[PDB]
Amino acid sequence: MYKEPFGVKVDFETGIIEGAKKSVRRLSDMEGYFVDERAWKELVEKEDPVVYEVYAVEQEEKEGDLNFATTVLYPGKVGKEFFFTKGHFHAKLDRAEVYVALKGKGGMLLQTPEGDAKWISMEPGTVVYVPPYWAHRTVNIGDEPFIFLAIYPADAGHDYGTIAEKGFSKIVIEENGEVKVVDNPRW
Amino acid sequence: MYKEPFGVKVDFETGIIEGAKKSVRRLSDMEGYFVDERAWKELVEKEDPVVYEVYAVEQEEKEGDLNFATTVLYPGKVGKEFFFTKGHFHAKLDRAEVYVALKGKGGMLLQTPEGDAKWISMEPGTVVYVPPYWAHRTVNIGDEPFIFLAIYPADAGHDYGTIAEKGFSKIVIEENGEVKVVDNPRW
Ligand code: NI
Ligand code: NI
């Protein structure tokens, strides 16, 4: 039986998708992700801010099918490091992804299985091509929510563990009022 | 070798992707597509208007990878029928597609291999899920350009021929200033 085509309204200003399933990620949800563990623990104890919310419209995991989701990445810092999504490689490593930036100031940090990293700045209208094999994490580098839409293969899946254990080979921090992409000491 | 991640600017007001492959389809490129052949012939001779332009960013045809393209679908009618894209099934029939409406007023006509049709209205912010097996054609029902972004599997390809020969089971026309989707009499 064929699946039904549908249209859903995406609000470019809030990232809310009609009919999507919501995911809420708080700072407490990201232990071991930020370099400055003291600032993390302190921020989690004081207020445990929401780091990002995701609104996903996903299909069964099937070759050739497509999922899509917006993310609203909140502004903030853990010590010097800007708020980011957990990041992942795809379970089917060779699956690509396309991101479309809708609101705010941010960027994407990507790395290969071997650790070689890339940084792609994102502003409203920027479309980012995430090639096969690249792990990817988005970072909010501004003062307002950073909102984007992502379209990804239905069978791409997720390898979060690799990133949770070793993180990214680079980190994105604020140094002298400037955004800088630098080596991860933890790496 | 790993492919290079990149970002490109997509302009939401003009639909232009900076540096993408540009394709132009004029009314003369769509012979046999509109029901009113005499009206098609007449408009071609009088003006041969551009019906739509496409800006595509494509990868090699490999499983799990992704292409993206904007379309600028110009307003117009051939007889009573609104301007539309040629439309296709995918060569790998079960490949889905995601459309993001950016500007203007239009919609998507879809149909199964067995001819069952569906119409989905699109206004700015509408995201349409084009499931596996459904042929799909966009239509402009307003008086300004209808602009959208499409993300599709790199290996979907196109089967333009089926639609070229017999068309969609439905057409989108204007009757007494109103937009109507009705049975295609040449189907
Ligand atoms: Ni992904
Ligand atoms: Ni298609």
UniProtKB/Swiss-Prot annotation, chains A, B:
What is the pH dependence described in this protein's record? Optimum pH is 7.0.
Query: Does the keyword Ligase feature in the UniProt annotation?
Result: no
Q: In which pathway does it act?
A: Carbohydrate degradation; glycolysis; D-glyceraldehyde 3-phosphate and glycerone phosphate from D-glucose: step 2/4
| Pfam families, A to Z | GPI
Q: Where in the cell is it found?
A: Cytoplasm
Q: Write out the residues that bind Fe cation.
A: H88, H90, E97, H136
| EC annotation from Swiss-Prot or TrEMBL | 5.3.1.9
Activity modulation comment: Inhibited by mannose 6-phosphate, fructose 1-phosphate and fructose 1,6-bisphosphate.
GO MF terms, alphabetically ordered: glucose-6-phosphate isomerase activity; iron ion binding
Output a single Gene Ontology CC term carried by this record.
cytoplasm
Needed cofactors, names only, are: Fe cation
Temperature-related activity notes? Answer: Optimum temperature is 90-96 degrees Celsius. Highly thermostable.
Gene3D superfamilies given in the database record: Jelly Rolls
Which keywords describe this protein according to UniProt?
A: Cytoplasm, Gluconeogenesis, Glycolysis, Iron, Isomerase, Metal-binding
Q: Which reactions are catalysed by this chain?
A: alpha-D-glucose 6-phosphate = beta-D-fructose 6-phosphate
* One GO biological process term: glycolytic process
Keyword Cytoplasm: yes or no? yes
Q: Which InterPro entries match?
A: G6P_isomerase_archaea/bacteria, G6P_isomerase_prok, GPI/OXD, RmlC-like_jellyroll, RmlC_Cupin_sf
Q: How, per the record, is the cofactor bound?
A: Binds 1 Fe cation per subunit.
Coiled-coil annotation: which residues?
Answer: none
- Subunit field text: Homodimer.
User: Which family does this protein fall into?
Assistant: Belongs to the archaeal-type GPI family.
What name does this protein carry?
A: Glucose-6-phosphate isomerase
What taxonomic classification does the UniProt entry list for its organism? Archaea, Methanobacteriati, Methanobacteriota, Thermococci, Thermococcales
